[PDB]
């Protein structure tokens, strides 16, 4: 079915001037952009956005990185969007993405495990939480 | 348990200059205001906000009224907030509110069934949907 | 002439549960509320908002205080709003406000010079800058 | 000097899937994106945004077009940004842009005079007004 999912272009990709190319990729893959904005997570907000990872070892590093500069979020809509977007971005380790998924966003724009260019919702459950975390219904147009 | 619910101060109450008194009431009742903003529904957004009522006979009138001028929404937080807030606002017919719940917001500020001063989420399910419709997680502070 | 000015209800007044009463005062004084929202200044944004004071001795305390909790901003519109609102809020030292302007907002709700309940734009120039700092044209309704 | 200017990607360009490529162009030209969002002008807001054109013959058509669908606004920052961005987008008639400025945004993505892909601020004065119209200081990051 037609689904919505959330992506966030991370500060590493922002700084590399990859934003336009990344959005273009999703457009070329056939997704409609239903919401879009640049903003900055406070550490507290990044922490809440990533609450499911609180007890993971990478958590503090992730929260700091995701609040270290401006990011851009977008709601993408399309057939089977959650699964397809997940596949389009590729493995979370950018270097591994270059090895096993060379045409993935992370392969193309990611640097390593932490600076891996982009975030996308993992599941229907997380897409619902993440989309509402960033965008109200008023912002989806 | 501690809950969150949504209220919307409608254009009739806005025009009566009731906004301050209405917020004050919820503050005196012990709720924390977690989000607040003045905005204007487009007819399309009002219709989406009230989608559960789309097949009801009052729908078009409701949509038109709720898009006829600026409104103010707030997220209220407190123990059993969803049902307590319903009770504080009173019966949806303002005249009936004066008869059976004379201390209610609708008895005090409402005119009739259409101009009834204020909206509040009806259930936990509707609260979840309505809060996200108006406010993102980024707007809850 | 009809003018617009900005007020911000500070964390001390928020915590005292004064928000509703303060908005009500401006409503009773005859102002139209043209924009309204609860948000939280980051330290950096508070500093930018108060940039004219950057070299003043109270700056760091002001920036820290105004970023220590959520605040509520409003755009108020009316004849001579800028000076009338200044007069309604009273002297910046709340204790002095009680001595020389006992009916002022700061006399009623303010504690001292730092916790003084409320901010209002100082001049037409600062009003223009402050309104744009907090609200876009899209948020004025 | 370093300046800020506003662009808006219009509904024609949005529908052609040009958003990513258009932002990429500005990134490659060396501009920093300081604010970004998708939204929809109401006809009233489009009319206020374009107030300087109220008495022009194209006004109603422009207002209707610019409120006919979602658009994306961005604040661009860079050396001499206002003049450079104005030149990058090219003549307002897209067909003429193809004739005299073939590498311009309007030549590349514009259709005709009305559907001409993009808007950019014309002057320092209009840039200031247009930026504040769309984005608050809180949204510039």
What torsion, rounded to 10 degrees, do the Cα atoms A39, A45, A51, A55 define?
A: 110
Q: Any idea which residues of C carry the catalytic annotation?
A: 119
Catalytic residue positions of A? 119
* Structure tokens, A71: 């990011």
Q: State both tokens at B101.
A: 């719940």
Which residue in D has a C-alpha nearest to residue C140's C-alpha? D133
Tokens of D137: 């200081």
Residue B10 annotated as part of some ligand binding site: yes
Report how this structure was experimentally obtained.
X-ray
**B75 Ramachandran zone, left/alpha/beta (phi>0; psi -120 to 50):** beta
Full 3-state SS string of chain D: CEEEEEEEECHHHHHCCCHHHHHHHHHHCCCEEEEEEEECCCHHHHHHHCHHHCCCCCHHHHHHHHCCCCEEEEEEEEECHHHHHHHHHCCCCHHHHHHHCCCCHHHHHCCCCCCCCEEECCCHHHHHHHHHHHCCHHHCC
Residue D50: which of D65, D40, D61, D62 has the closest Cα? D62
CA–CA distance, D5 with D79 (Å, rounded to integer): 11
**Cβ-nearest to B24 among C24, C70, C72:** C24
Q: How far apart are the first and last CA of chain B?
A: 20
Q: Which two tokens stand for residue D105?
A: 């945004």
* Resolution of the experimental structure, in angstroms: 2.1
Write the secondary structure of chain B as one string of H (helix), E (strand) and C (coil).
Answer: CEEEEEEEECHHHHHCCCHHHHHHHHHHCCCEEEEEEEECCCHHHHHHHCHHHCCCCCHHHHHHHHCCCCEEEEEEEEECHHHHHHHHHCCCCHHHHHHHCCCCHHHHHCCCCCCCCEEECCCHHHHHHHHHHHCCHHHCC
The partner residues of D2 in beta bridges, in order of sequence, read D79
Cα–Cα distance for residue pair D100/B28, rounded to 1 Å: 67
Q: For residue D132, give the nearest of C39, C49, C132 by CB distance.
A: C132
Does D77 reach chain A within 8 Å, measured CB to CB? no
Helix (H, G, I), strand (E, B) or coil at C79: strand
Distance CA B88, CA B101 (A): 9
Contact indicator for B38, B72 with CB cutoff of 8 Å:
yes
> Which residues, at least 6 apart from A99, have a Cβ–Cβ distance to it below 8 Å?
none
DSSP letter at C17 equals: T
Task: Note whether D67 and D40 are within 8 A (CB).
Answer: yes
A50 touches chain B (CB under 8 A): no
Cα separations in angstroms, D34 against A38, C9, D37, D75, D141: 8, 28, 11, 5, 6
Domain span holding position B70: 1-141
CA D39 from chain centre, in angstroms, equals 13
> Which residues in chain A have Cβ-Cβ distances shorter than 8 Å to D24?
19-21, 24
Distance, in Å, from the CA atom of B67 to the CA atom of B57, rounded to the nearest integer, reads 17
| SS (HEC) of chain A | CEEEEEEEECHHHHHCCCHHHHHHHHHHCCCEEEEEEEECCCHHHHHHHCHHHCCCCCHHHHHHHHCCCCEEEEEEEEECHHHHHHHHHCCCCHHHHHHHCCCCHHHHHCCCCCCCCEEECCCHHHHHHHHHHHCCHHHCC
Q: Does A73 touch chain D (CB under 8 A)?
A: no
Residue D48: CB partners within 8 Å, gap ≥ 6?
Answer: C137, D133
Q: Which two tokens stand for residue B40?
A: 């204007």
Sign of the Cα pseudo-torsion (D85, D86, D92, D94, in order):
negative
Give the separation between CA A93 and CA A113, rounded to whole angstroms: 4
Number of domains in chain A: 1
User: What's the CATH code of the domain at A28?
Assistant: 3.30.70.141
Residues of B labelled catalytic: 119
Residues 6+ apart with CB under 8 A from D96: none
């Amino acid at each position: 079915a037609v689904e919505r999912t959330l992506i966030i272009v991370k500060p590493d990709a922002m700084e590399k001037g990859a934003l336009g190319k990344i959005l273009d990729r999703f457009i070329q893959e056939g997704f409609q952009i239903k919401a879009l904005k640049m903003f900055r997570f406070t550490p507290e907000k990044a922490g809440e956005f990533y609450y499911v990872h609180r007890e993971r070892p990478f958590f503090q590093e992730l929260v700091e990185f995701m609040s270290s500069g401006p990011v851009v979020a977008a709601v993408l809509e399309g057939e089977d969007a959650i699964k397809r977007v997940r596949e389009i971005i590729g493995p979370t380790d950018s270097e591994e993405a270059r090895k096993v998924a060379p045409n993935s966003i992370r392969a193309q724009f990611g640097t390593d495990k932490g600076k891996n260019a982009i975030h996308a919702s993992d599941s229907p459950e997380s897409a619902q939480y993440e989309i509402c975390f960033i965008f109200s219904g008023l912002e989806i147009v």
